[PDB]
Amino acid sequence: LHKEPATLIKAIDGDTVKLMYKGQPMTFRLLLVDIPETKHPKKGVEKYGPEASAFTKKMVENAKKIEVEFDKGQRTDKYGRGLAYIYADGKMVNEALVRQGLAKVAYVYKGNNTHEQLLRKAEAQAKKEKLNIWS
């Protein structure tokens, strides 16, 4: 896997970020995480969704360096979002969210599983600490 530079344009949600990637604007879905979504057809703003969205926001807004890492499977979903691991100053946003108890590890989508064990590891620890969603 290779990291590539990107530039923040806008954080959208705990799990979606808009980035300037290779000269063009692109929406990215974070790989292997499932959030208590704030963007839902008809709900009330899911429990921990606001905190997850704020966490992602602060992490990418505060970073000096954003990098994108595509996995070896399919690179976009049916909505045209890039499927990737995102790093903020060398730290994986996907893993931080899970480690902090602000996301669960999702099912593997189309061969994209390189950091699955790493994330499952992080999720175990958050559950063990009864963090946030696991409280």
Q: Which structural domain, as residue segments, surrounds residue 66?
A: 1-135
Residue 99 falls in the annotated catalytic set: no
In the chain, the number of structural domains is: 1
Adjacent-strand bridge partners of 105: 33
Q: Residue 58 and residue 14: Cα distance in Å, rounded?
A: 10
* Tokens matching residue 135: 């409280």
Residue 24: alpha-carbon gap to chain centroid:
20
Q: Residue 95 and residue 128: Cα distance in Å, rounded?
A: 16
The residue count of the chain comes to 135
Residue 37 falls in the annotated catalytic set: yes
Half-sphere exposure of 26 (CA within 13 A, CB side): 19
Name which of 92, 106, 88 is nearest 35 in CA terms: 106
The catalytic position among 51, 81, 95, 99 is 81
Adjacent-strand bridge partners of 44: none
Tokens 């969704």, residue located: 49
Q: Residue 82 and residue 126: Cα distance in Å, rounded?
A: 27
Look up the CATH number of the domain holding residue 28. 2.40.50.90
Tokens 């602060």, residue located: 58
Is residue 119 within a helix (H) or strand (E), and if so which, with residue range?
Answer: helix 116-128
Residue 29 falls in the annotated catalytic set: yes
Q: Residue 60 and residue 79: Cα distance in Å, rounded?
A: 22
In angstroms, what CA-CA distances link 17 with 45, 80, 117, 124, 125? 18, 13, 23, 26, 26
* Tokens matching residue 67: 């990098």
Q: Is 111 exposed, middle or buried (0-12, 13-18, 19+ CB in 10 A)?
A: exposed
Contact 80, 22 (CB under 8 A): no
The catalytic position among 29, 51, 67, 99 is 29
Experimental technique: X-ray
Provide the residue type at 88 as one letter.
Answer: A
